[PDB]
Amino acid sequence: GEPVYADAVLNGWLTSMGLGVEYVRAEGNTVYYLDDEGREVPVLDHACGFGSLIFGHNHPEIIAHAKAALDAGTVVHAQLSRQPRANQISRILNDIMRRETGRDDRYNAIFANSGAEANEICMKHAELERQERITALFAEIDAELDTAREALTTGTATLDTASLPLDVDGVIADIHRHNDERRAERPLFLTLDGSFHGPARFLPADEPELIGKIVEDERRSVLTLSLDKDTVRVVERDFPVVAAIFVEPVRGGSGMKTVTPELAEELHRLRDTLGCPLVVDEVQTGIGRTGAFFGSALLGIRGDYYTLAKAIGGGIVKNSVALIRQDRFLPAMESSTFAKDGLSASIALKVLEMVEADGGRVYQRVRERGQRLEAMLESVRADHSDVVSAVWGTGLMLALELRDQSNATSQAIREKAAHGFLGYVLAGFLLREHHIRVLPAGPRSGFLRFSPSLYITDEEIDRTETALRSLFTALRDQDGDRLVLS
């Protein structure tokens, strides 16, 4: 009845999915809520801030470091002074990229608050590159336009009339208008359907053969006068319409699908062809979570720029970064108020020390925990194929695909399937009946995500298996009354 100031529809919706619990403490892969009696129930967190918590909630090393930084009087707001930590971080990042790819490429670092802000710096930089390409194109055209004019009026050549669908001084200004309606047209950002970053086009990542035809349609030309000894033609010239190409090495919104080699080569072709940078968006992945620092490196994606965010905060603060290759870098760029802050930078260096510690024994751990957890999800799917289509992802960034339940026998399940809430409803079963926090991914919530810390135990994975077998038995048995509340 009473006045509410936030979360009225959210909290209402969460309760009806069976997810309306409040977490009062967290440590490692455990988050705790209070029962009616007032005691702390441990819940195993397979969400982990959508894969942000590669080190689990509130790792004692990150907590120690943060308390140490705060007592040390770390300068949080030092805008427009020397902040060496930015450079210190970009160094370790460049080093890791060199090590993981073979390439001896060098990247400049720009810091930001969110992953969206990191990709937006990339979009602006790519748009600066396209404008540079346009200035050069339109100059060449001016030089070709002059030459053509002093050659039609010299009488050394004559305007072939067959090219006029597209006097002299009139055709010049008539072209100069056509070229101007192009230059002030908006730039194009190629992205894959299942991803949004920061005037775009979403392409079918499942059908890469079809991407080339779709990009080919966006091809636009400007016009010029091509002098050829004795004659002058009105010819078409390629105008750079695409500013950048954006790829997540693991597509959350597609249910944690990995960039296939067939798609990696279509993105490389496009980048080589259109001449615009390939931006690798690793913001939503979580550093180390694929079993390499860089997903891009693991799956052989050769980016011109890269973004990072998740896990760089140590699960306590918010930090993001854009790496742009120095040989392309327009220093025109190089800031925001909260960006490049001192506290998030001190903690970044701690996380990078932690993930790189003991000759990268953290990446080894991630790979084998990921192998263990994938093998369990595959074991469950083999027995529960009526309700589970696939397991997707790599390392500790995995998901199960749910078979469509929009035709379900149960009214209660079928309603929820239809409204796009199946994943949330099955996640409500896993909370109340098994004390396991899972959240779905994908737009029909038709996937279940497993993105826990690298400290997940064999016992914890086993409890997850028991819980999934239980869930998928209930779903098979169309037990609406046990899966859906009311």
Add this chain to the structure above:
Amino acid sequence: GEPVYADAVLNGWLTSMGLGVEYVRAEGNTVYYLDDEGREVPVLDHACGFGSLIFGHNHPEIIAHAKAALDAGTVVHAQLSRQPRANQISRILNDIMRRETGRDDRYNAIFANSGAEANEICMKHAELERQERITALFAEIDAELDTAREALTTGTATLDTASLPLDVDGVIADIHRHNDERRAERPLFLTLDGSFHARFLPADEPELIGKIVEDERRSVLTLSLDKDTVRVVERDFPVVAAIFVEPVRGGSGMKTVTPELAEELHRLRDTLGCPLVVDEVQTGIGRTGAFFGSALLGIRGDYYTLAKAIGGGIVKNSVALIRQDRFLPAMESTFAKDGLSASIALKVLEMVEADGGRVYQRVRERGQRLEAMLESVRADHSDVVSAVWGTGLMLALELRDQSNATSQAIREKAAHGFLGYVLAGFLLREHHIRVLPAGPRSGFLRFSPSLYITDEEIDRTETALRSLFTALRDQDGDRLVLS
């Protein structure tokens, strides 16, 4: 010669302005660098994270609270679970707004990472409202189009031909095409020149804004049946989605929204029917001498954004307040609504609201003290200082243009837009005072210190400014600009 991975042009540019110091520690209004001998030099910070540090750097209360939150195992990442702190915060915010404005309005809270993210939630919500206005408009038109058709073919009325510059079944589809080229046109965000959060309007000339907005007026078409006749008439199409105002415009040199401008923004909002979004993100809560600048300067917003100072100068947090009676619940990010920044938000709000708003009193009198000093300096230094702008502890001095300067060294820097930065370099090296400029020619000097600034600290600032403006008067290029 070595490999560099960040800040190569920045650090280079900062050194040539005399700002290439590295701050190793901060407490209160002091930040410290190390000299060649290795000892900590205290520097007085009049920048304070562009007014983010209303409580100064690393306030021991915010630090204690944060350490307490971290040891408590505070859930930082609880996405899609009950997080009551969000509601707890939106309550105190609504309360403060009620108290400072008189109004008993209720606002829903949406949390975000940056001020930009807070204003972007506002733009999307305002754009949802415009689409709702469009759906209703285009329905009414469909109903008017039908009525008109069953009345031209009934023969009860005839199409007045005088309105045809703009058969029947042909004119219907001919209109339905004109209306469709409008609906898929992009929405318009009115903003004032001196801020980004579109069309930038002259805040200095509010009489001129009305004519400019009047030009953006677009119409869709319909058939107006009137008993015996049917006309093709024009109808107002909502083109403007939202109007955006900073109560204090940083990018204009800390200028306050005048009453004359506050009433032109109110008129526009009442006229166009789109929300007035008050952007208080870049101001800093409490810094004007009220929680809300909007409240101090009598700006009546439909939505409000906040960011600066909500982090306690340690974390990043922002919020959009949208009036519940407008709120399209359709709306309601990974890092957004995090547990740590929420725990610290409640601490800042407890601190600023403590002792019957004793903090706002203090801000007003420290601001009065500091403004009175800046005015005393300008009275003697009118050759180089035009104005003092701002209110509370969000003040700036306006520099007279130095693009005509006698000194080659000054005149070059004036021309490249770096005067403010160069005078700030003098204040650092010769007086141990951190000032940064504001505005696009860096033709302003900002003073946005903590509410703990001392009379002795303000006095050192006066001594330093008198010194700076004497050197500038004397066109002493060699002392102001480094070679």
